[PDB]
Write a protein that binds this DNA or RNA. Structure first.
Ligand code: CAC
Ligand code: CAC
Ligand code: CAC
Ligand code: MG
Ligand code: MG
Ligand code: MG
Ligand code: MG
Ligand code: MG
Ligand code: MG
Length: 758
RNA sequence: UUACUGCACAGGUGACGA
DNA sequence: TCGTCACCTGTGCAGTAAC
């Protein structure tokens, strides 16, 4: 019946008395806040300046007096609540404001972890993990047309290495290459400094410097990254460092796991509710009960979408709750029509790895047998092919080569293909040490580039994967096979969808931001992905081949109008038919872009048909969490004491925050990885207010389904493929744009139906 | 770069207004 | 240029693979 949130009701006054000045230029605001400081809360909104009196006594303020009622204008007190929460928690210094964010005053988890594991080191006290709480006052709608303000509690961990760089050098951590940040953050200045090249007297030598090429040892510390933590502590702790991380994991789980998080939120509410919260001298707020999403009595705030069905035939008869279980039984969705039943696959690999690659290829093509039931059949039988023919392309290249690996791979590929006839796909095996080389000499990207140019999609793979123990390898090979099949134009599966209307197009856009280093400014690229409603299931459409960020809204507009035109020709819509277009992204579109997109599509389809249009943003990092106290979780593994996903809402749970907003649970206890995995965070789904199609519950469930459409993996994706695929495309095409001899010429020819971006 | 998941840090950025 | 509310994107490390 009920999903509990991480938020509490805030009992506010019905009305607050305010003073208003017209203030068209908002630049005067900062100085005016400063003048009236301590005595007035000041807030700029809609060309006017609102003043709420906090404390009797001057300065005085000229303006028009007005009663601001909370039910009608909750943004005023919501804003004041941001400041009042800080003032209500005086013993807690704000590490950030709006939302007020602060550290636990005592708890420090590295010390606690060292004690539980029985470790120690004279430098351990300089490594800190401190619980970090935030309090976000948020407007929500307990029912349509009525707003309220709630305070939402979130918890993270601050990682910080306060150790002097001098003390870390001795001994004997190699600080070279490590990123380093300012120790005191001057207001509005960058934290990042650069990487450590060397340290001498009192100065650090920086490369990839953000400003000055050197900084005093006293003004810099290591950035609190997991990388720096692991580098430092493994050097200091050696064999025992693993004991510390697992202990640290247990510690953090004591804050993050379902019942532990619910308890921590409970405890925070009790603390906040102990006294009134002072909105002004005269005016008090009161933190009340935990906010719930339920269906009682006038509220309709929670529902459970049905299980997504993975579908493997056009009749809908062959379906399954799980991708792999389904693919195992039925084979792929397009098995009866799949053209290339004898694919020829080029295999490019370092000559020294021959034996390992053959073992991998055999496992891949012919399976691992019934001792490894996750991948028994192998690619050929799995997909219902007749066979796979490998043309072996060894490369004389060693891992120690870091400057000429890519040229050796590409020369070998060119020489092999020149005499080998036609290949339909490639597998490229990479040394770990080459995987993350800069792009000008990175063999992943150069071989990707060359083969794509030639119209040959690739599935690449790093040697540590090639060398996985069999129990892990079987799962690797599931994901490898699915993506490879789709790279061969295959359609592994679809997801259930019933009719509803005459045609439905979903287009997504995704962003990548590329640079050669953290110091070089990131360049933006976009990708576009389309999905069509099919007979009884969704079908993946075509994909963008151009990636320029500038003019991206024209790109969306042209994609949609082009597609609508073709859909109409193809399907021959009858007068009165209804067509729906949905847009997905991780950010909202501009109102002006929505107007322009809606105008153009409406004009393109014309007046014979009805058109519905929705613009949706999918958010991951918001302050909302769902707790299902009825959920006991599952054993961490068969069949232990520990449980995983305790209190995790079922997948497909959808809660109403407001008219335009839903929370969508995606990670159920089954999908939750381990006992220490935190209570999952739902996706926030938000409808653009200018949308003409308004059913955000439908749109939330549609997003859920599209999460199951990913052919990169048997497990669902973190975000719908309309966005996810677009990000992968934008990143690849963005990187390829800088690789010499790259051409997109085959993306819409040989690769038009290839899912080359997986 | 089989992936999924989590987290951390860093960079900032988007949308709405006047 | 501004205020205001909000959260996105990149990178690296670790545990696990919906029955
Ligand atoms: C209907 As329910 C609160 O179990 O998602
Ligand atoms: C000690 As407390 C900030 O969780 O109330
Ligand atoms: C699949 As083979 C190259 O070991 O015959
Ligand atoms: Mg206090
Ligand atoms: Mg406790
Ligand atoms: Mg099998
Ligand atoms: Mg290697
Ligand atoms: Mg009508
Ligand atoms: Mg891939």
């Amino acid at each position: 019946r009920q999903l509990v949130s991480n938020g509490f009701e805030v009992n506010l006054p019905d009305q607050v008395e305010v003073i208003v000045r017209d203030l068209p230029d908002p630049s005067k605001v900062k100085e005016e806040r400063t003048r009236l400081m301590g005595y007035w809360f000041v807030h700029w909104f809609d060309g006017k300046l609102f003043h709420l009196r906090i404390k009797a006594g001057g300065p005085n303020v000229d303006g028009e007096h007005r009663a601001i009622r909370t039910a009608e204008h909750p943004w005023l007190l919501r804003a004041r609540l941001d400041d009042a929460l800080e003032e209500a928690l005086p013993k807690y210094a704000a590490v950030k404001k709006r939302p007020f964010t602060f550290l636990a005053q005592k708890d420090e988890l590295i010390d606690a972890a060292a004690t539980a594991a029985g470790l120690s080191h004279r430098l351990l006290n300089s490594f800190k993990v401190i619980p970090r709480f935030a309090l976000s006052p948020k407007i929500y709608e307990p029912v349509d047309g009525t707003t309220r303000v709630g305070v939402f509690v979130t918890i993270g961990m601050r990682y910080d290495i306060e150790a002097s760089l001098r003390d870390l050098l001795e001994a004997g951590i190699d600080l070279r290459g490590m990123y380093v940040v300012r120790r005191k953050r001057q207001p509005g200045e960058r934290g990042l400094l650069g990487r450590v090249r060397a340290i001498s007297d009192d100065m650090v030598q920086l490369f990839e410097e953000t400003d000055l090429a050197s900084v005093n040892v006293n003004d810099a510390k290591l950035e609190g990254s997991k990388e720096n933590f692991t580098r430092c502590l493994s050097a200091l702790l050696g064999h025992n460092y693993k004991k510390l991380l697992n202990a640290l994991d247990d510690q953090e789980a004591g804050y993050r796991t379902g019942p532990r998080f619910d308890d921590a939120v409970r405890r925070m509410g009790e603390f906040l509710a102990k006294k009134p919260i002072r909105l002004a001298d005269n005016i008090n707020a009161q933190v009340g009960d935990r906010i719930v999403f339920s269906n009682e009595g006038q509220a309709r705030n929670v529902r459970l979408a049905p299980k997504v069905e993975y579908v493997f035939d056009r009749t809908g008869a062959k379906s399954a709750e799980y991708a792999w279980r389904g693919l195992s039984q039925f084979g792929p969705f397009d098995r009866p029509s799949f053209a290339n039943r004898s694919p020829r696959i080029l295999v490019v690999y370092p000559s020294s790895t021959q034996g390992k690659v053959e073992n991998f290829l055999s496992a891949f093509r012919d399976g691992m047998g019934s001792n490894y039931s996750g991948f028994s059949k192998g690619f050929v039988d799995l997909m219902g092919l007749t066979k796979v023919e490998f043309v072996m392309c060894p490369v004389e290249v060693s891992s120690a080569d870091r400057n000429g690996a890519h040229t050796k791979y590409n020369s070998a590929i060119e020489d092999k293909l020149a005499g080998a006839g036609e290949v339909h796909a490639g597998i490229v095996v990479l040394f770990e040490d080459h995987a993350r080389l800069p792009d000008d000499r990175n063999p992943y990207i150069h071989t990707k580039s060359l083969l794509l140019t030639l119209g040959v999609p690739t599935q690449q793979v790093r040697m540590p994967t090639v060398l996985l123990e069999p129990k892990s390898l079987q799962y690797t090979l599931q994901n490898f096979s699915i993506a490879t099949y789709a790279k061969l134009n295959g359609t592994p599966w679809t997801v259930n969808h019933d009719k509803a209307i005459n045609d439905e197009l979903v287009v997504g856009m995704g962003l990548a931001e590329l640079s050669g280093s953290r110091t070089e400014k990131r360049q933006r690229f976009v990708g576009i992905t389309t999905v069509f409603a099919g007979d009884g299931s969704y079908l993946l459409g075509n994909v963008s081949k151009e990636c320029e960020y500038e003019g991206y809204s024209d790109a969306i507009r042209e994609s949609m109008t082009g597609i609508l035109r073709e859909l109409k020709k193809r399907n021959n819509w009858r007068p009165g038919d209804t067509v729906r277009v949905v847009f997905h992204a991780h950010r909202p579109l501009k109102r002006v872009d929505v107007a322009s997109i809606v105008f153009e599509c409406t004009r393109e389809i014309g007046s014979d048909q009805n058109i519905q249009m929705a613009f949706v943003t999918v958010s991951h990092d918001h302050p909302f969490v769902l707790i299902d106290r009825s959920e006991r979780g599952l054993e961490a593994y068969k069949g232990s004491t520990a449980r995983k996903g305790v209190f995790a809402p079922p997948r497909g749970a959808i809660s109403r925050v407001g008219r335009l907003t839903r929370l969508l649970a995606v990670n159920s206890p089954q999908l939750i990885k381990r006992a220490n995995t935190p209570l999952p965070t739902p996706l926030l789904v938000s409808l653009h207010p200018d949308s003409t199609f308004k059913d955000v519950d439908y749109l939330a469930e549609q997003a859920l389904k599209f999460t199951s459409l990913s052919w990169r993996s048997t497990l669902p994706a973190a975000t719908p493929v309309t966005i996810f695929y677009s990000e992968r495309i934008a990143e690849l095409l963005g990187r390829l744009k800088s690789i010499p001899n790259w051409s997109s010429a085959n993306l819409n020819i040989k690769l038009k139906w290839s899912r080359w971006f997986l």
